[PDB]
Design a protein around this ligand. Structure first.
Ligand SMILES: Nc1ncnc2c1ncn2[C@@H]1O[C@H](COP(=O)(O)OP(=O)(O)OP(O)(O)=S)[C@@H](O)[C@H]1O
Ligand SMILES: Nc1ncnc2c1ncn2[C@@H]1O[C@H](COP(=O)(O)OP(=O)(O)OP(O)(O)=S)[C@@H](O)[C@H]1O
Ligand SMILES: Nc1ncnc2c1ncn2[C@@H]1O[C@H](COP(=O)(O)OP(=O)(O)O)[C@@H](O)[C@H]1O
Ligand SMILES: [Mg+2]
Ligand SMILES: [Mg+2]
Lengths: 872, 392, 231, 384
């Protein structure tokens, strides 16, 4: 620890800073040339990151702190050249010349004048000062003061120059500071900033457009209404202007369709319609625009260039589904799937487990017996006379003949081949539920097809029959993938009839309301009129609350405008049991984001109140709405609910936490995980008949599982206990739901990454219907079988002109790379390098090879995979 | 810039999460108490229900009975036997002999029968899980995969296609030959569905006498109780060579279990929904009585795949590693005189390690050269091949 | 504490009050080997020097062994005829330093104390490092494999100190090379049959305990026994 | 804790803190729900109350349970210390999760119902190989060959510490590792240094002890040992000198090969189990490898196969340096004229001569070790 002799710094770097006031005042030359020498001494022997124990950076702040405060603050006349030295020598130690709190005093040395990176040509690391300005000084300079004096007049282009400085200083993770200079800057008016930043974003480079992409889209997944309204369309035009690939429009701009602007979606569709270069990316965009995120498309692209470019519309409308039909006919033939049915052999060891067998002889088991034909024959396992499970019970439980004829729609699931040929032999029978399920399959089979199968051709033969009930079920279901106003004109007088039987008028708003997503509030007005006519004079059974109010929401979902509030919330301001229909559409419009200000009022408004049989229904629906907002958190709330609800409600409930704290997960997803999937057994390995155990008794998920273990263990211990008089439906319906096909499981609103593709309208009725009892046997087989028909489920393909090459596949896990070094790593599931056309993959992203260069997507789940091998 | 504030707002709200978790209660981590915020179920009723109107009904064993009058004979562990009676509250029938039942501690009367005995040591083979092998990647057995699948799954899959013709399906098959005997078994182990069980026969050599036989018996019991089951046998060479015994009594414990097992499939009301496959290292000295028809129908073999299946394997264990895109894999097999696909995967591994040796990512011919010559001739000296090439 | 016999009121099974053994002591009672000390040494002098050098040194001087920077030893091995002091000197050596004198014959009547099944014998180590100033002894084929199973264990793996062991045998040339690794063993010592002065002194030792007659002449008798043994 | 593993930025952007404050919001909300439940409706303390009633119900004399069977309809059969079993009930508060045949359960006193369970004081056998501490120094202390040594480094340490390199290579690491050479070259010591570097589970046992004077046990010992090893953690177990079990025979053994064969067979199987192999890698160390059963040498069971040679004299000098560095020797050390004595000596012989000469010094209380001491050393240690 030697000190002395060679210690030049306790000599020349000691006195010249110390005697700087003794050599600056009335000394023009001795100040500058020696100050320039100090500048060189601090910029020459310190840039080498070898001795951070600098003779200056660790000794010149001993005395030069008060002295430099006498130099720059106290002099007030730092002229042209000498201050170029002051803000270059008193600035590199200036973070170290002071203590920790620099976040408010990066100014007194630097802010007096910006020294023209010149002392950073050979050293990497006052942008902190510009951040100070933007975040505090600009904040309270333009909070309600959008336009003001110099504090914005220069601060705007100062932010612009430092923004060009982010990706021009070192090209390291300093690049990712431009979002940290554009979004915190003018928090709400992100337009006035990104309008200025994107123009430069076009001209900097065409490679770093992806790190900023993922970062900003994580900024957007959850986003303030202003931020979701501005920064999205500010991050949107990157492939439109900054790059020329433009193919990220479809599945990464749909989020701007419903919340942002109901017309910007179709105008960007027009943008696609203008740049039709060339064949492939056009198909790529337009594919998902009809059958994978929205509808009203199969009649959108029939203009005057209909040969194969514009005539792609019939493809996207019916022939893409037909191509997947040939897929499910040939490939599913190839891999494993035959026509059918061994699930009864499965339950063969239920007779020798502990004693005497042949004791389970349950009757409502017939409900699951229709499932043995519906579920296990989903996705093109067509059959003939195998429908005896849907023929004997069809002809032997009046209500059970609809399940025996709705299982047929699941047999030829999503089919377009032979409905009018498989239903003919089982139509002319005039048993209400046989014809009901058959004419409803007339909409089930062609669901998504929405072609000339049942506009008014199949189910009109049952609405001239007002059988009456399901006549709108399949009719509007075939038009789920449609929004043609003709059908709403065809069946508006259904509710406009105010039928003396509520069994149809109830779900009338569900049928007519689904087909539409936007304006024409005549639906809402007529429905609220019928509400206050009939839902007013009633404080009894929730059919008027389980069936009526949901049409309103499903006609005004996905718009964080808050405009629907003062319109429809003011429309169902009524008695509390009618106020059940009040806050639905209030919350129906915030699917994937995080606005916890909305979450606290899902607990503040009515937590327990001690709820002496007063607001258990309203609070059940409160918890129901709480199931939304979390469907797509970009991994921000997937835990935040499975913990909060389990801790608060399911632990400390009265009728909410004992009967409604579970459907959260059923609404959430069908992924499959030990967090919440095995958590339902916690309330399910304990039946607890005290509360209405058909709450606990009332597998809704897809993605076949190995959870057969505890299910069959309970069924074994269910030989004596766990009776079957009504739960025989339960056991095997649940056993059949998840593993209906080994495929056809991707309906959890995670597409592209998490873009919706819903999914929501056709499904919501069921999981909003099991409230609570009285429909587990009679009034629930209208929707227990074939409720949701929005299922798009495979991604890994080639889909080119020929399907010549097999593929170049290497499927991997979900991505987590946010800030890394170039090039960013992709994923660690690189082990499997195969060439399969395998199933989609729930937590899956596929990374290709074989020099295809992927100029098709690079980010669509039908990777069309253009190619070129300019890499010899 | 806000590093201190962000980290402290992180960890302080984590500490508050901890505090509010403890407010609920997760501490007092117990020795068998349920999750603290869960077990509140058993609070008033269940507690005073599972106990007050509920009695033990002590486990009990039957002896015999008499008609027209209950008068059954019980047997219990430590206490003596008693002429006893059942409960009216159960059907008067299924309390016949050879059975375990429950009997109250006090009235000494029956309430319910219980499953037959278990010996969980024998439960330790209900494998319960099908791993992820597939007949795809085991090629070469071109005329073996089908030869297996026919007498392996087809009857269960088509219990008509062999019935209308009025012919009985075969029952037994064994493997012989690192030819891939266990691999082919694992592939057949996964793909099926019915209750699959296996036993490493080596786990039968006891220290007492006969214990293995009793265990095998209970195994066949739980088998017959099952309605569609398949048993696999692993390396039964240990289970007994032969009754070559002479003078001094040796190895006799083995042959005892041997004969006992071998009875368990021939004549006298046989199994039923029961088929099996075993496999040896050296069949040279296996028992004849097992070779008997009706026990040992098929004799599918695993030899050295030729070059064709070998080429397919070269595809198989290389198609998932960065390599030269234009190698002539033909020569690879061309320098594989006698080997197993295991050794193919081995050569692949060695080449990969020689690649990661200095820097590269994709493979070259040279890597394969060094992998082969080393693995082949440097590792030649032992190579374990001959004494099994003669199966002796 | 563990191994604490206790009183407990029986109605409500309430643990009430307190009441055994150290199992090693029980083992020793089972053995009852001839406890002794240096005084009864008959002609074993340089032997005494060497055994002291090897055993006592690496206890009280852990700084010397490394002041030399030399590795400490781990074991000792002897040989000789039938009864010469193989265990006689072994007992005393342990005695003059307070080493819990322990031996094992691979027996079973002793075995119940250590391990329930006690598949191996290493299980004795559980107590070995429990009473550190202690020694285990090995007598006169499985004794050799036991010696292996003991030596190769406390070989850097078990850094615990204060554990010394000695095997006993004759004609060392008949045991396994597994006990011949030039580093596996530390050193041996020679025990020669009794000569003149040793024979005389052993007489002297095994005489003083008797009420002689006036005049003794150990010398004559010593001139008579032709080194049959020390027994 | 363990809230949400998405803290991906690790930078000073809005992402981290937004996660933090939103979790703050949900945590405040759930804590205030927990508060408001007791606000109007305390109805008990529920800290130690839901537990007081349990203690009330749970039988004061805790009866040692012994799980044998499972009927999870909250009532199964349990036994007694001598096996006076019955058909007692089970309750909700017992977390019916780890129920397994042969478990330490808790039984009520009156009806013997399941009070609960108990953790296992374990194990009177694991500890016997459960590794205590780093026993020795770095490989750098060994030296002499360092090539195949580096090969073992690559095959063993490299995998865990770089679970990426083989991944970019897209290949899982090798399975088997083995040494072989003459008696005294570096097969056990090397393993010692291996463990010295490691940060994973480790055990040690000798094949010689595998034989038991009874019949059949040793096999089951192997089974359960592999099981327990696999059950714990990143682990590499090792057995020294298996060939022992294949070379000698102890008359105390009940039979002969009649158990050797079967035990070794099941053994070899247990490294190629069709079932989940799990996170295990094995090293080997034998003096007579040529003569043991080659079946074990099958590719796939054993992968990395490395020879152990006679170190060279020019390296013997380095060994000298090793065992002579930190001793205050005498200046007369001419190590070379001592190296060539045994034309094929071992690295153990260096330590031998060194420590022997030191003993010679200690006898005469001297300090620096002179050459004639080396003379007498070479004479004693070698000439027998
Ligand atoms: N035909 C094959 N195709 C692909 N891999 C094979 C083939 N044959 C052997 N293997 C490999 O061999 C390993 C498994 O060999 P096993 O099936 O255990 O051998 P085995 O013929 O049963 O020999 P034993 O009984 O263990 S000596 C795996 O690494 C397989 O990949
Ligand atoms: N190459 C070497 N370098 C340094 N020291 C060595 C070397 N070889 C042997 N030694 C020393 O001698 C001891 C013997 O090494 P071990 O690892 O026991 O050899 P081994 O070949 O496994 O022995 P066997 O055959 O089981 S007796 C080591 O612990 C070192 O102290
Ligand atoms: N050198 C000796 N000095 C005194 N007594 C001895 C000597 N050698 C043997 N003995 C006597 O022999 C008996 C013990 O025999 P010991 O030498 O321990 O047997 P071994 O060495 O053959 O195992 C005791 O009675 C002991 O007094
Ligand atoms: Mg095998
Ligand atoms: Mg060794």
């Amino acid at each position: 620890m030697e000190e002395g002799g060679r210690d030049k710094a306790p000599v020349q770097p000691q006195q010249s800073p110390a005697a700087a006031p003794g050599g600056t005042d009335e000394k023009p030359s001795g100040k500058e040339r020696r100050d320039a020498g100090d500048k060189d001494k601090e910029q020459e022997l310190s840039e080498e990151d070898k001795q951070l124990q600098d003779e200056l950076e660790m000794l010149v702040e001993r005395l030069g702190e008060k002295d430099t405060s006498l130099y720059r603050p106290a002099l007030e006349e730092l002229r042209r050249q000498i201050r170029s030295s002051t803000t270059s020598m008193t600035s590199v130690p200036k973070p170290l010349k002071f203590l920790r709190p620099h976040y408010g005093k990066l100014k007194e040395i630097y802010e007096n004048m910006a020294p023209g990176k010149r002392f950073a040509a050979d050293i990497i690391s006052a942008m902190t000062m510009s951040g100070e300005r933007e975040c505090l000084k600009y904040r309270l300079v333009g909070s309600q003061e959008e336009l003001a004096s110099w504090g914005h007049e220069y601060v705007r282009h100062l932010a612009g120059e430092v923004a060009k400085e982010w990706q021009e200083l070192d090209d390291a993770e300093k690049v990712q500071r431009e979002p940290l200079l554009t979004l915190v800057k003018e928090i709400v008016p992100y337009n006035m900033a990104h309008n200025a930043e994107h123009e430069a974003c076009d001209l900097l480079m065409e490679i770093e457009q992806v790190d900023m992409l993922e970062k900003d889209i994580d900024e957007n997944a959850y986003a303030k209404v202003c931020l979701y309204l501005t920064s999205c369309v500010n991050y949107v035009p990157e492939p439109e202007n900054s790059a020329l690939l433009r193919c990220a429009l479809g599945v990464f701009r749909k989020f701007s369709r419903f919340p942002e602007a109901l017309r910007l979606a179709l105008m960007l569709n027009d943008m696609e319609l203008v740049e039709d270069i060339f064949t492939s990316c056009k198909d790529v965009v337009v594919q998902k625009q009809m059958a994978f995120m929205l509808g009203r498309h199969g009649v959108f692209l029939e203009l005057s260039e209909d040969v194969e470019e514009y005539e792609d519309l019939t493809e996207i409308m019916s022939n893409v589904q037909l191509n997947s039909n040939f897929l499910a006919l040939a490939r599913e033939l190839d891999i494993m799937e035959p026509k059918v049915d061994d699930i009864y052999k499965t339950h063969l060891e239920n007779n020798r487990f502990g004693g005497s067998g042949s004791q389970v002889d349950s009757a409502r088991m017939n409900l699951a017996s229709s499932f043995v034909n519906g579920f296990v024959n989903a996705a093109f396992g067509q059959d003939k006379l195998l429908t005896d499970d849907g023929n004997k019970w069809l002809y032997k439980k009046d209500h059970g003949m609809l399940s025996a004829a709705a299982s047929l729609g699941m047999i030829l699931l999503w089919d377009v081949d032979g409905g009018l040929t498989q239903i003919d032999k089982y139509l002319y029978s005039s048993e209400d539920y046989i014809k009901s399920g058959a004419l409803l399959a007339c909409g089930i089979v062609n669901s998504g097809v929405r072609n000339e199968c049942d506009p008014a051709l199949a189910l009109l033969s049952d609405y001239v029959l007002h059988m009456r009930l399901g006549s709108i079920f399949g009719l509007g279901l075939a038009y789920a993938g449609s929004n043609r106003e003709d059908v709403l004109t065809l069946l508006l007088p259904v509710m406009g009839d105010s039928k003396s039987s509520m069994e149809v008028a109830g779900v009338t708003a569900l049928a007519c309301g689904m087909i539409a997503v936007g304006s024409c509030n005549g639906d809402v007005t007529s429905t609220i009129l019928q509400t206050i006519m009939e839902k007013s004079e009633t404080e009894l059974k929730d059919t008027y609350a389980r069936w009526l109010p949901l049409g309103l929401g499903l006609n005004h979902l996905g718009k964080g405008e808050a405009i629907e509030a003062i319109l429809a919330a003011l429309e169902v301001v009524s008695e509390p049991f009618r106020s059940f229909a009040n806050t639905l559409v209030d919350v129906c419009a915030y699917a994937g984001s995080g606005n916890v200000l909305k979450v606290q009022q899902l607990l503040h408004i009515c937590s327990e109140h001690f709820d002496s049989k007063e607001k258990e229904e309203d609070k059940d629906k409160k918890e129901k709405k709480d199931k939304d907002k979390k469907e797509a958190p970009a991994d921000m709330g997937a835990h935040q609910g499975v913990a909060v609800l389990g801790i608060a409600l399911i632990a400390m409930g009265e009728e909410i936490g004992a009967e409604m704290a579970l459907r959260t997960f059923g609404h959430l997803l069908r992924y499959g995980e030990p967090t919440l999937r095995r958590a339902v057994p916690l309330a399910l390995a304990l039946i607890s008949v005290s509360n209405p155990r058909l709450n606990i008794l009332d597998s809704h998920d897809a993605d076949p599982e190995v959870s057969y273990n505890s299910i069959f263990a309970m069924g074994m211990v269910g030989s004596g206990t766990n009776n079957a008089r009504l739960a025989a439906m339960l056991r095997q319906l649940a056993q059949y739901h998840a593993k209906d096909p080994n495929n056809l499981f991707m309906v959890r609103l995670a597409q592209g990454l998490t873009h919706l593709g819903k999914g929501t309208l056709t499904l919501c009725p069921y999981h909003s219907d099991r409230q609570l009892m009285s429909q587990v046997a009679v009034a629930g087989l209208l929707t227990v079988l074939v409720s949701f028909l929005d299922v798009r489920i495979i991604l890994g393909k080639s889909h080119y002109v020929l399907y010549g090459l097999v593929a170049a596949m290497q499927p991997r896990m979900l991505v987590t790379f946010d800030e890394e070094l170039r090039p960013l790593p992709v994923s660690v599931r690189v082990g499997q390098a195969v060439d399969v056309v395998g199933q989609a993959g729930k937590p899956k992203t596929i990374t290709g090879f074989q020099t295809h260069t992927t100029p098709v997507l690079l980010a669509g789940e039908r990777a069309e995979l253009a190619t070129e091998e300019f890499l010899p | 810039t806000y590093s201190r504030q962000i980290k402290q707002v992180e960890d302080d709200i984590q500490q508050l999460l901890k505090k509010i978790n403890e407010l609920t209660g997760i501490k007092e981590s117990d020795t068998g108490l349920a999750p603290p915020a869960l077990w509140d179920l058993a609070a008033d009723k269940q507690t005073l229900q599972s106990e007050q109107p509920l009695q033990v009904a002590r486990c009990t064993k039957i002896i015999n009975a008499d008609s027209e009058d209950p008068k059954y004979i019980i047997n219990v562990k430590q206490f003596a036997k008693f002429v006893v009676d059942l409960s009216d509250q159960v059907a008067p029938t299924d309390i016949e002999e050879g059975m375990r039942v429950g009997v109250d501690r006090n009235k000494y009367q029956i309430h319910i029968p219980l499953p037959p005995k278990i010996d969980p040591t024998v439960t330790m083979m209900q494998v319960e899980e099908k791993p992820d092998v597939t007949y795809s990647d085991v090629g070469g057995c071109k005329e073996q995969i089908e030869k297996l699948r026919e007498v392996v799954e087809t009857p269960l899959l088509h219990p008509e296609r062999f019935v209308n013709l009025g012919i009985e399906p075969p029952k037994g098959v064994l493997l012989f030959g690192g030819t891939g005997k266990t691999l082919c078994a694992r592939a057949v182990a996964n793909r099926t569905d019915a209750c699959f069980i296996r036993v490493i026969g080596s786990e039968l050599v006891q220290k007492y006498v006969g214990e293995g036989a009793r265990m095998v018996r209970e195994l066949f019991e739980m088998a017959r109780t099952k309605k569609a089951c398949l048993i696999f046998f692993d390396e039964i060479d240990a289970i007994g060579g032969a009754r070559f015994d002479d003078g001094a009594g040796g190895d006799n414990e083995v042959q005892r279990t041997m004969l006992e097992l071998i009875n368990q499939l021939d004549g006298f009301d046989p199994r039923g929904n029961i088929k099996v496959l075993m496999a040896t290292n050296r069949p040279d000295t296996l028992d004849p009585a097992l070779m008997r028809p009706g026990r040992l129908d098929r004799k599918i073999e695993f030899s050295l795949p030729d070059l064709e299946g070998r080429t397919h394997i070269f595809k198989i264990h290389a198609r998932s590693m960065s390599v030269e895109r234009d190698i002539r894999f033909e020569l690879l097999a061309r320098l594989c005189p006698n080997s197993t696909g295991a050794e193919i995967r081995s050569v692949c591994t060695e080449a990969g390690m020689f690649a990661i040796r200095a820097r590269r990512k994709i493979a070259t011919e040279k890597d394969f050269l060094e992998a082969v010559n080393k693995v082949i001739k440097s590792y030649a000296k032992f190579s374990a091949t001959p004494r099994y090439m003669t199966y002796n | 504490t563990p191994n604490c016999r206790v009183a407990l009121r029986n109605d409500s099974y309430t643990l009430h009050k307190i009441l055994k053994v150290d199992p090693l002591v029980s083992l020793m009672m089972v053995e009852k080997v001839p406890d002794s000390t240096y005084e009864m040494i008959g002609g074993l002098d340089k032997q005494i020097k060497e055994i002291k050098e090897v055993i006592e040194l690496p206890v009280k001087h852990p700084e010397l062994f490394e002041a030399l920077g030399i590795a400490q030893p781990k074991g000792v091995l002897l040989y000789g005829p039938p009864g010469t002091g193989k265990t006689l000197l072994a007992r005393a050596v342990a005695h003059h330093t307070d080493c819990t004198f322990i031996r094992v014959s691979g027996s079973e009547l002793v075995q119940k104390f250590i391990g329930e099944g006690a598949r191996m014998v290493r299980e004795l180590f559980v107590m070995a490092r429990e009473h550190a100033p202690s020694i285990i002894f090995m007598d006169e084929s499985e004794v050799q494999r036991t010696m292996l199973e003991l030596l190769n264990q406390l070989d850097g793996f078990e850094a615990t100190k204060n554990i010394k062991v000695i095997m006993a045998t004759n004609r060392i040339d008949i045991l396994d090379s597994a006990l011949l690794r030039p580093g596996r063993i530390d050193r041996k010592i020679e025990f020669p049959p009794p000569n003149e002065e040793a024979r005389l002194d052993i007489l002297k030792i095994h005489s003083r305990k008797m009420n002689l007659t006036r005049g003794i002449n150990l010398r004559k008798i010593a001139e008579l026994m032709p080194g049959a043994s020390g027994a | 804790a363990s809230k949400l593993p998405l803290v991906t930025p690790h930078t000073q952007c809005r992402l981290k803190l937004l996660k933090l404050e939103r979790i703050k919001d949900y945590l405040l909300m759930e804590e205030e729900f927990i508060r408001n439940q007791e606000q109007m409706k305390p109805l008990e303390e529920k800290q130690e109350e839901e537990r007081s009633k349990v203690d009330d119900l749970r039988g004061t004399p805790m009866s040692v349970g012994t799980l044998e069977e499972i009927i999870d309809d909250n009532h199964a059969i349990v036994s007694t210390s001598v096996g006076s079993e019955h058909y007692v009930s089970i309750l909700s508060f017992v977390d019916k999760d780890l129920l397994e045949p042969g478990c330490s359960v808790l039984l009520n006193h009156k009806v013997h119902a399941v009070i609960g369970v108990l953790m296992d004081d374990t194990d009177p056998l694991v500890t016997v190989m459960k590794v205590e501490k780093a026993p020795q120094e770095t490989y750098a202390d060994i030296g002499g060959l360092d090539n195949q040594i580096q090969e073992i480094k690559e095959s063993v340490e490299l995998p865990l510490t770089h679970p990426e390199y083989y991944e970019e290579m897209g290949i899982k690491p090798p399975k088997g590792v083995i040494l072989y050479g003459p008696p005294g070259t570096g097969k056990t010591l090397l393993a010692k240094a291996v463990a010295n570097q490691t940060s994973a589970t480790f055990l040690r046992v000798v094949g010689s002890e595998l034989i038991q004077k009874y019949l059949g046990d040793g096999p089951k010992l192997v089974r359960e040992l592999f099981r327990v090893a696999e059950e714990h953690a990143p682990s590499i177990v090792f057995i020294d000198e298996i060939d022992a079990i294949g070379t000698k025979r102890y008359d105390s053994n009940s039979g002969g090969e009649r158990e050797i064969q079967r035990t070794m067979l099941e053994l070899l199987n247990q490294l190629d189990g069709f079932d989940s192999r799990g996170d295990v890698k094995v090293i080997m160390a034998t003096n007579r490898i040529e003569t043991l059963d080659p079946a074990l040498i099958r590719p796939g069971r054993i992968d990395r196969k490395i020879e152990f040679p006679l170190p060279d004299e020019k390296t013997k000098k380095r060994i000298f340096q090793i065992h002579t560095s930190r001793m205050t020797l005498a200046d007369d050390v001419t190590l070379d004229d001592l190296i060539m004595a045994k034309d094929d000596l071992s690295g153990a012989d260096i330590k031998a001569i060194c420590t022997e000469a030191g003993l010679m010094a200690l006898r005469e209380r001297r300090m620096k070790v002179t050459n004639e001491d080396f003379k007498k050393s070479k004479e004693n240690v070698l000439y027998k």
